[PDB]
Amino acid sequence: AMRVISGEYGGRRLKALDGDNTRPTTDKVKESIFNMIGPYFDGGMALDLYSGSGGLAIEAVSRGMDKSICIEKNFAALKVIKENIAITKEPEKFEVRKMDANRALEQFYEEKLQFDLVLLDPPYAKQEIVSQLEKMLERQLLTNEAVIVCETDKTVKLPETIGTLKKTRETVYGITQVTIYRQ
C-alpha cells in the first residue's frame, strides 16, 4: 500500500486512486526521485500538475517544502487527495485545484507565482511536457534554482534542451522514465 517515504509524514499510509492499468508511480520510484533532487528542502513551493492521489506533492512537503499546489483533471480524485492531505494534518500546506493543466499555468502567471519544484506525470496520451515547460519559461513561473521532475513511459524521447532548461539526469526504472531539468 502507498506510503509517504521520508520527512515529517514519513511512514504514513496514503490512499491510491482506483487502479486503471495505467503506468504507475511506485513508492520506490518516488523515493528515487526525492533522494536525487533532495533528499530534503529548506522550504519552497511545489507544483504537482497531474496530482492524482497527491503522493508526490505530499512527499515534497513532508521533506520540507512549504506548500504544494496540486492540479486535478478528474472529480473522482478530489476525495482521495483530500483524505491524503488530511493524513498530513497540515492542510494549509496544500492547495487542490480542479482545472485543466494548461489553464492552470496561465492562472499561476496571473497570480505572479514561482515554483521551486515542478512534478510532471501526465497520462501517456496527454503528454505535453515540452510545450508546458516552454509556457513556464515564457511566464517566468520558475525560481532561480527550480527543478523539474518528469515521469514518462520509457519510450518517450524528451529533448536535452528546452529553452533555458537543460536535462541534468535521466533514469529508467522498469518502464518508468524519470527525467530531470534545471536552468
PDB file of all heavy atoms in Angstrom, residues 21-41:
ATOM      1  N   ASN A  21      -4.950   0.299 -14.719  1.00  0.00           N
ATOM      2  CA  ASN A  21      -3.943  -0.323 -15.589  1.00  0.00           C
ATOM      3  C   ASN A  21      -3.024   0.643 -16.340  1.00  0.00           C
ATOM      4  O   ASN A  21      -2.414   0.261 -17.345  1.00  0.00           O
ATOM      5  CB  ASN A  21      -4.598  -1.304 -16.572  1.00  0.00           C
ATOM      6  CG  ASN A  21      -5.251  -2.482 -15.874  1.00  0.00           C
ATOM      7  OD1 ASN A  21      -4.604  -3.195 -15.104  1.00  0.00           O
ATOM      8  ND2 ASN A  21      -6.534  -2.697 -16.143  1.00  0.00           N
ATOM      9  N   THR A  22      -2.927   1.883 -15.859  1.00  0.00           N
ATOM     10  CA  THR A  22      -2.022   2.873 -16.451  1.00  0.00           C
ATOM     11  C   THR A  22      -0.678   2.876 -15.715  1.00  0.00           C
ATOM     12  O   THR A  22      -0.578   2.354 -14.607  1.00  0.00           O
ATOM     13  CB  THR A  22      -2.640   4.281 -16.463  1.00  0.00           C
ATOM     14  OG1 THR A  22      -2.977   4.669 -15.126  1.00  0.00           O
ATOM     15  CG2 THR A  22      -3.897   4.311 -17.336  1.00  0.00           C
ATOM     16  N   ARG A  23       0.350   3.451 -16.341  1.00  0.00           N
ATOM     17  CA  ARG A  23       1.719   3.412 -15.811  1.00  0.00           C
ATOM     18  C   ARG A  23       1.788   4.005 -14.396  1.00  0.00           C
ATOM     19  O   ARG A  23       1.508   5.194 -14.205  1.00  0.00           O
ATOM     20  CB  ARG A  23       2.667   4.158 -16.747  1.00  0.00           C
ATOM     21  CG  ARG A  23       4.105   3.659 -16.720  1.00  0.00           C
ATOM     22  CD  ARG A  23       5.079   4.817 -16.872  1.00  0.00           C
ATOM     23  NE  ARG A  23       5.149   5.564 -15.617  1.00  0.00           N
ATOM     24  CZ  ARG A  23       4.771   6.826 -15.453  1.00  0.00           C
ATOM     25  NH1 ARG A  23       4.324   7.542 -16.476  1.00  0.00           N
ATOM     26  NH2 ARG A  23       4.863   7.377 -14.252  1.00  0.00           N
ATOM     27  N   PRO A  24       2.144   3.173 -13.399  1.00  0.00           N
ATOM     28  CA  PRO A  24       2.159   3.631 -12.014  1.00  0.00           C
ATOM     29  C   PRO A  24       3.390   4.466 -11.667  1.00  0.00           C
ATOM     30  O   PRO A  24       4.368   4.502 -12.430  1.00  0.00           O
ATOM     31  CB  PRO A  24       2.174   2.319 -11.224  1.00  0.00           C
ATOM     32  CG  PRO A  24       2.937   1.393 -12.089  1.00  0.00           C
ATOM     33  CD  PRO A  24       2.532   1.752 -13.504  1.00  0.00           C
ATOM     34  N   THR A  25       3.307   5.142 -10.524  1.00  0.00           N
ATOM     35  CA  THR A  25       4.446   5.790  -9.885  1.00  0.00           C
ATOM     36  C   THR A  25       4.620   5.058  -8.564  1.00  0.00           C
ATOM     37  O   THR A  25       3.895   5.304  -7.592  1.00  0.00           O
ATOM     38  CB  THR A  25       4.184   7.286  -9.647  1.00  0.00           C
ATOM     39  OG1 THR A  25       3.959   7.926 -10.905  1.00  0.00           O
ATOM     40  CG2 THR A  25       5.371   7.950  -8.951  1.00  0.00           C
ATOM     41  N   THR A  26       5.556   4.121  -8.552  1.00  0.00           N
ATOM     42  CA  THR A  26       5.737   3.252  -7.400  1.00  0.00           C
ATOM     43  C   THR A  26       6.404   4.026  -6.277  1.00  0.00           C
ATOM     44  O   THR A  26       7.050   5.047  -6.522  1.00  0.00           O
ATOM     45  CB  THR A  26       6.591   2.026  -7.752  1.00  0.00           C
ATOM     46  OG1 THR A  26       7.915   2.441  -8.121  1.00  0.00           O
ATOM     47  CG2 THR A  26       5.954   1.252  -8.902  1.00  0.00           C
ATOM     48  N   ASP A  27       6.250   3.537  -5.051  1.00  0.00           N
ATOM     49  CA  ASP A  27       6.925   4.146  -3.916  1.00  0.00           C
ATOM     50  C   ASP A  27       8.450   4.132  -4.098  1.00  0.00           C
ATOM     51  O   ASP A  27       9.124   5.063  -3.679  1.00  0.00           O
ATOM     52  CB  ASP A  27       6.498   3.480  -2.595  1.00  0.00           C
ATOM     53  CG  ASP A  27       5.165   4.020  -2.047  1.00  0.00           C
ATOM     54  OD1 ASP A  27       4.506   4.892  -2.673  1.00  0.00           O
ATOM     55  OD2 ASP A  27       4.768   3.556  -0.959  1.00  0.00           O
ATOM     56  N   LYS A  28       8.988   3.091  -4.742  1.00  0.00           N
ATOM     57  CA  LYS A  28      10.433   3.010  -4.990  1.00  0.00           C
ATOM     58  C   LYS A  28      10.919   4.109  -5.945  1.00  0.00           C
ATOM     59  O   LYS A  28      11.988   4.694  -5.745  1.00  0.00           O
ATOM     60  CB  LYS A  28      10.820   1.633  -5.529  1.00  0.00           C
ATOM     61  CG  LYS A  28      10.596   0.502  -4.541  1.00  0.00           C
ATOM     62  CD  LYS A  28      11.179  -0.789  -5.093  1.00  0.00           C
ATOM     63  CE  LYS A  28      11.116  -1.911  -4.067  1.00  0.00           C
ATOM     64  NZ  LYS A  28      11.561  -3.214  -4.656  1.00  0.00           N
ATOM     65  N   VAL A  29      10.123   4.389  -6.973  1.00  0.00           N
ATOM     66  CA  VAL A  29      10.421   5.489  -7.898  1.00  0.00           C
ATOM     67  C   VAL A  29      10.281   6.839  -7.197  1.00  0.00           C
ATOM     68  O   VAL A  29      11.124   7.724  -7.356  1.00  0.00           O
ATOM     69  CB  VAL A  29       9.528   5.425  -9.147  1.00  0.00           C
ATOM     70  CG1 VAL A  29       9.677   6.700  -9.995  1.00  0.00           C
ATOM     71  CG2 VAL A  29       9.892   4.185  -9.966  1.00  0.00           C
ATOM     72  N   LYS A  30       9.222   6.982  -6.404  1.00  0.00           N
ATOM     73  CA  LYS A  30       9.047   8.181  -5.597  1.00  0.00           C
ATOM     74  C   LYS A  30      10.278   8.445  -4.708  1.00  0.00           C
ATOM     75  O   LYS A  30      10.775   9.568  -4.648  1.00  0.00           O
ATOM     76  CB  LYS A  30       7.760   8.092  -4.764  1.00  0.00           C
ATOM     77  CG  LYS A  30       7.489   9.317  -3.893  1.00  0.00           C
ATOM     78  CD  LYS A  30       6.068   9.318  -3.326  1.00  0.00           C
ATOM     79  CE  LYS A  30       5.829   8.121  -2.411  1.00  0.00           C
ATOM     80  NZ  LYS A  30       4.429   8.055  -1.874  1.00  0.00           N
ATOM     81  N   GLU A  31      10.751   7.404  -4.019  1.00  0.00           N
ATOM     82  CA  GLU A  31      11.937   7.515  -3.175  1.00  0.00           C
ATOM     83  C   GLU A  31      13.167   7.918  -3.998  1.00  0.00           C
ATOM     84  O   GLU A  31      13.930   8.811  -3.608  1.00  0.00           O
ATOM     85  CB  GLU A  31      12.209   6.190  -2.448  1.00  0.00           C
ATOM     86  CG  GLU A  31      13.399   6.291  -1.504  1.00  0.00           C
ATOM     87  CD  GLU A  31      13.964   4.958  -1.084  1.00  0.00           C
ATOM     88  OE1 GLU A  31      13.237   3.945  -1.132  1.00  0.00           O
ATOM     89  OE2 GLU A  31      15.152   4.930  -0.699  1.00  0.00           O
ATOM     90  N   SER A  32      13.315   7.282  -5.156  1.00  0.00           N
ATOM     91  CA  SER A  32      14.449   7.566  -6.035  1.00  0.00           C
ATOM     92  C   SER A  32      14.446   9.023  -6.466  1.00  0.00           C
ATOM     93  O   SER A  32      15.475   9.696  -6.402  1.00  0.00           O
ATOM     94  CB  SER A  32      14.425   6.643  -7.251  1.00  0.00           C
ATOM     95  OG  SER A  32      14.823   5.339  -6.858  1.00  0.00           O
ATOM     96  N   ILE A  33      13.273   9.503  -6.875  1.00  0.00           N
ATOM     97  CA  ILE A  33      13.100  10.894  -7.290  1.00  0.00           C
ATOM     98  C   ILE A  33      13.540  11.836  -6.183  1.00  0.00           C
ATOM     99  O   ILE A  33      14.382  12.708  -6.389  1.00  0.00           O
ATOM    100  CB  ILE A  33      11.620  11.191  -7.691  1.00  0.00           C
ATOM    101  CG1 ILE A  33      11.305  10.556  -9.052  1.00  0.00           C
ATOM    102  CG2 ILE A  33      11.357  12.712  -7.783  1.00  0.00           C
ATOM    103  CD1 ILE A  33       9.808  10.519  -9.393  1.00  0.00           C
ATOM    104  N   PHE A  34      12.963  11.676  -4.996  1.00  0.00           N
ATOM    105  CA  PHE A  34      13.200  12.673  -3.974  1.00  0.00           C
ATOM    106  C   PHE A  34      14.582  12.619  -3.359  1.00  0.00           C
ATOM    107  O   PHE A  34      15.141  13.655  -3.005  1.00  0.00           O
ATOM    108  CB  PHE A  34      12.062  12.690  -2.955  1.00  0.00           C
ATOM    109  CG  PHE A  34      10.855  13.418  -3.464  1.00  0.00           C
ATOM    110  CD1 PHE A  34       9.839  12.726  -4.122  1.00  0.00           C
ATOM    111  CD2 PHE A  34      10.761  14.805  -3.342  1.00  0.00           C
ATOM    112  CE1 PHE A  34       8.729  13.413  -4.621  1.00  0.00           C
ATOM    113  CE2 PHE A  34       9.662  15.500  -3.847  1.00  0.00           C
ATOM    114  CZ  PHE A  34       8.647  14.793  -4.492  1.00  0.00           C
ATOM    115  N   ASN A  35      15.155  11.421  -3.286  1.00  0.00           N
ATOM    116  CA  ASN A  35      16.542  11.317  -2.856  1.00  0.00           C
ATOM    117  C   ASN A  35      17.527  11.944  -3.851  1.00  0.00           C
ATOM    118  O   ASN A  35      18.567  12.465  -3.449  1.00  0.00           O
ATOM    119  CB  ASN A  35      16.892   9.864  -2.551  1.00  0.00           C
ATOM    120  CG  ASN A  35      16.238   9.365  -1.268  1.00  0.00           C
ATOM    121  OD1 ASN A  35      15.734  10.156  -0.451  1.00  0.00           O
ATOM    122  ND2 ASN A  35      16.230   8.049  -1.087  1.00  0.00           N
ATOM    123  N   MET A  36      17.192  11.897  -5.136  1.00  0.00           N
ATOM    124  CA  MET A  36      18.018  12.518  -6.159  1.00  0.00           C
ATOM    125  C   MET A  36      18.004  14.044  -6.037  1.00  0.00           C
ATOM    126  O   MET A  36      19.061  14.681  -5.975  1.00  0.00           O
ATOM    127  CB  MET A  36      17.537  12.079  -7.534  1.00  0.00           C
ATOM    128  CG  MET A  36      18.329  12.615  -8.695  1.00  0.00           C
ATOM    129  SD  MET A  36      18.199  11.370 -10.164  1.00  0.00           S
ATOM    130  CE  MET A  36      16.276  10.804  -9.994  1.00  0.00           C
ATOM    131  N   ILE A  37      16.807  14.620  -5.980  1.00  0.00           N
ATOM    132  CA  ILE A  37      16.650  16.089  -6.033  1.00  0.00           C
ATOM    133  C   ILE A  37      16.740  16.776  -4.663  1.00  0.00           C
ATOM    134  O   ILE A  37      16.931  17.992  -4.575  1.00  0.00           O
ATOM    135  CB  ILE A  37      15.332  16.507  -6.764  1.00  0.00           C
ATOM    136  CG1 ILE A  37      14.102  16.007  -6.001  1.00  0.00           C
ATOM    137  CG2 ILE A  37      15.338  15.982  -8.216  1.00  0.00           C
ATOM    138  CD1 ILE A  37      12.831  16.831  -6.273  1.00  0.00           C
ATOM    139  N   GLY A  38      16.600  15.981  -3.605  1.00  0.00           N
ATOM    140  CA  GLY A  38      16.599  16.470  -2.242  1.00  0.00           C
ATOM    141  C   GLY A  38      17.890  16.024  -1.576  1.00  0.00           C
ATOM    142  O   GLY A  38      18.977  16.457  -1.990  1.00  0.00           O
ATOM    143  N   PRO A  39      17.797  15.122  -0.578  1.00  0.00           N
ATOM    144  CA  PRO A  39      16.592  14.456  -0.075  1.00  0.00           C
ATOM    145  C   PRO A  39      15.603  15.344   0.690  1.00  0.00           C
ATOM    146  O   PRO A  39      14.432  14.964   0.839  1.00  0.00           O
ATOM    147  CB  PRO A  39      17.163  13.372   0.849  1.00  0.00           C
ATOM    148  CG  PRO A  39      18.443  13.948   1.319  1.00  0.00           C
ATOM    149  CD  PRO A  39      19.007  14.641   0.121  1.00  0.00           C
ATOM    150  N   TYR A  40      16.058  16.506   1.166  1.00  0.00           N
ATOM    151  CA  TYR A  40      15.232  17.433   1.958  1.00  0.00           C
ATOM    152  C   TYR A  40      15.333  18.824   1.381  1.00  0.00           C
ATOM    153  O   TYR A  40      16.272  19.109   0.648  1.00  0.00           O
ATOM    154  CB  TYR A  40      15.642  17.418   3.447  1.00  0.00           C
ATOM    155  CG  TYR A  40      15.407  16.046   4.013  1.00  0.00           C
ATOM    156  CD1 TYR A  40      16.467  15.145   4.197  1.00  0.00           C
ATOM    157  CD2 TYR A  40      14.105  15.605   4.262  1.00  0.00           C
ATOM    158  CE1 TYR A  40      16.226  13.850   4.670  1.00  0.00           C
ATOM    159  CE2 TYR A  40      13.856  14.311   4.719  1.00  0.00           C
ATOM    160  CZ  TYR A  40      14.922  13.449   4.933  1.00  0.00           C
ATOM    161  OH  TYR A  40      14.670  12.179   5.375  1.00  0.00           O
ATOM    162  N   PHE A  41      14.367  19.672   1.728  1.00  0.00           N
ATOM    163  CA  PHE A  41      14.270  21.029   1.179  1.00  0.00           C
ATOM    164  C   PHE A  41      14.070  22.044   2.287  1.00  0.00           C
ATOM    165  O   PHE A  41      13.363  21.780   3.266  1.00  0.00           O
ATOM    166  CB  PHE A  41      13.076  21.120   0.210  1.00  0.00           C
ATOM    167  CG  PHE A  41      13.011  20.003  -0.791  1.00  0.00           C
ATOM    168  CD1 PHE A  41      12.132  18.920  -0.600  1.00  0.00           C
ATOM    169  CD2 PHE A  41      13.820  20.020  -1.919  1.00  0.00           C
ATOM    170  CE1 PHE A  41      12.066  17.889  -1.547  1.00  0.00           C
ATOM    171  CE2 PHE A  41      13.764  18.996  -2.866  1.00  0.00           C
ATOM    172  CZ  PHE A  41      12.890  17.925  -2.685  1.00  0.00           C
TER     173      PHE A  41
END
